[PDB]
Ligand binder design. Structure first.
Ligand code: 2SQ
Ligand code: 2SQ
Ligand code: 2SQ
Ligand code: 2SQ
Lengths: 213, 209, 209, 213
């Protein structure tokens, strides 16, 4: 979702147009210099972009190169799918800030391109709050990574359907999902009510025969 | 040791020349394709490479790509210090890479396109898998330095305790923990914990500029 | 080396026991008189002593005064590290001190009073003189660290120049000076200066936390 | 003068009264703990105080111990002579600040006295403007040291009286002091006018026969 999204921009310098690859929350940015900006050139970056990390969706306000098929297509191989005021505000500014950064080392660099990357190195590296945006991406990603596997775990759990005794005497009530399994232990919710029960008490059914696995 | 360590190796390939990044624990790669090959040309990408991953050092099969001044020039901006069967594995990776490119080669007119795709495959390739990558590792590292710092802080402080029932006062000892009722510490071989009245812990000392 | 270095030595004297500070280049002393002698008691004054002069290390004739925990305790708050004919000169100083006290002894009922006076005499005693003291030395030191820092900064930076008329680019070289028209640098054995277009100087690199 | 002056105060803690020795410009402060405050005790500090550095004059708003002879007397052996709103404002505050500092490490120290010195160590040591007050004293002193010797040099120069030819033909005018001597070189001011002249042109007279030296 929002962790997946990255913001992409192109601005013109010395005629030559810069390639900008902002990360929406982490702010890690990858930018690249192409002798000429083209939808063609745009794609080459994207492949690497997906390669550094997965993006569900990427944003550009207008489509001059994105609309171009090679770009739309590239998005499909990645499966990245082309596209909050506060989030909105940061991007133009994000583009703006690097230039300011860029100017400082321009005298520092023979080649403007050589300079821009340096400009970017610092931006990821520069920082009492935060460890710098670049550091943030690794984390944001990390938390998500756990999440996804966990979600998957959750999904796995969701399928199975519970059988419960409750008191040893009572008539049965419709089956519920199982939150957790311990030996002699099960956790489920009949409707909204949560109860834990012993193994001999409850049998746990596999939800899917015929699964392709 | 391995974290923050990346390996780049010369690639011989049909047509244009490209070089591929390796982070050894992830095996992660961020290769780029260059029409012209010089360690220098290599540098521009490398400069891009460090930002995505701070890399402490790199070990090179060939001095010559390393020898070019500009290449060292990159090392310094980075503060990267060149790291003067595992290489065969990196090689194997390169090999794997080559194979991968081939599988998808038909799909793309341009070799470069293929290579990135190839990069993609190694990347996010299920297998506990390489694809998930070292991000978890980097995070653990991000977490790691602070702990190393806090412990280093605990290490920095010197705490002076008196064995209970002993007028003689015990030498400063590395403190394991601080508690308002009691703080835990080891002098060297023997570790003891005492109540606040029994011992005192200096606040700061000046060193390190 | 000598600046920031002070020597304290055990004093045997009539009545009460006092110990005297020495800064070797100044020969400056800030002795105090203690009814009870322990390295510990010594410490309270020492703690006072460091503030007036940061002292890096002290060399002691006797381990025992040094051995007491509290004494080491003082060393650490200071970050002072005990420094495990010149000693005879310090001794001579002590001797001189003793004599000095005697000259004025008659004037004062209390031995302590005399000693301070004695301290005063060594102090501000004309002779290029000790009395003017190391203050000039301390100042030069205060000035010194910043220069060592600025040079260290110049040392930190690496500058890359191309010999004029040479496509081959010269390895980074320690830069002696920066000029908008030209900057001065030495690679190692040979030192050359070039115009800004001929060479480039990286802005910063990251190291030292 | 003002470099010479130091500010001295006594405040009461735990009944016991602290001894405070502020430096007017440098702010370096020496303070000492006396089991009991007395004019007697006060003196002991002063001797050391003059000993660390010379003070022309020292300040206390009221005289309970200073008025005491032993204190006045002590001042004479040192030759220190007992006694600007901004300068005035800093002292009470100076006394106030250390206490705040003192409290922090009080838990740090078994003995309050042990603590106060530490409190002071920091105050001299703690610092983008300045190198910290303590560092300042060494400097302020240093500049003064040069000054005094220089003044002395000046005084030496002042005594001598100049004889000048000016043009080789002209009648002479009253003698002036000599600012500087170079071989074949002399600098003097006849009244307010400054002129430089050759040796053969001008003779330089020693100002004092009968000097005790
Ligand atoms: C085919 C192709 C193209 C594509 C190409 C390719 O070369 C590029 C340098 C443009 C990446 C290629 O090697 O095939 N080419 C050459 C095209 O002519 C083209 C035309 C229309 C749409 C896509 C491409 C563009 C892509 F970004 C892309 C792909 C496939 C994988 C996902 O990304
Ligand atoms: C300047 C420079 C150079 C360098 C350059 C630069 O342009 C490249 C296209 C080679 C990156 C530059 O913009 O100055 N150039 C042009 C040189 O001529 C050069 C010569 C000797 C050593 C380094 C460079 C090479 C580097 F690897 C490098 C840097 C700066 C950052 C750290 O790494
Ligand atoms: C605490 C302490 C001690 C210390 C003390 C202290 O009181 C003295 C009167 C001895 C200075 C204190 O106030 O705590 N005390 C009381 C101890 O009992 C003690 C025992 C072992 C080691 C040091 C001290 C000794 C020191 F040299 C010292 C310090 C702190 C600053 C650095 O130097
Ligand atoms: C005599 C004396 C006294 C003095 C003393 C002396 O002992 C002190 C501990 C008080 C310093 C001394 O050793 O003589 N004594 C003991 C007195 O009784 C006394 C009485 C009146 C005035 C001064 C002193 C006080 C001083 F601060 C002092 C001097 C002389 C040198 C300058 O300073």
């Amino acid at each position: 979702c929002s962790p997946g999204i990255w913001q992409l921009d192109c601005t013109h310098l010395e005629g030559k147009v810069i390639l900008v690859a902002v990360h929406v929350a982490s702010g890690y940015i990858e930018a690249e210099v192409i002798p000429a900006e083209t939808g063609q050139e745009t794609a080459y970056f994207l492949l690497k972009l997906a390669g550094r990390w997965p993006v569900k969706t990427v944003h550009t306000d207008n489509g001059s190169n994105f609309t171009s098929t090679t770009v739309k297509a590239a998005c499909w191989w990645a499966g990245i799918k082309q596209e909050n005021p506060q989030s909105q505000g940061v991007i133009e500014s994000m583009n703006k800030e690097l230039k300011k950064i860029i100017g400082q080392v321009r005298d520092q660099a023979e080649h403007l391109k050589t300079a821009v990357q340096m400009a970017v190195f610092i931006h990821n590296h520069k920082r009492i709050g935060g460890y710098s945006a670049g550091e943030r991406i690794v984390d944001i990603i990390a938390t998500d990574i756990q999440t996804k596997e966990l979600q998957k775990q959750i999904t796995k759990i969701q399928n199975f359907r519970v059988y419960y005794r409750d008191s040893r005497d009572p008539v049965w009530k419709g089956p519920a999902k199982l939150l957790w399994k311990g030996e002699g232990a099960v956790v489920i919710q009949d409707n909204s009510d949560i109860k834990v029960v012993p193994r001999r008490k409850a049998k746990i059914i596999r939800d899917y025969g015929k699964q392709m696995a």
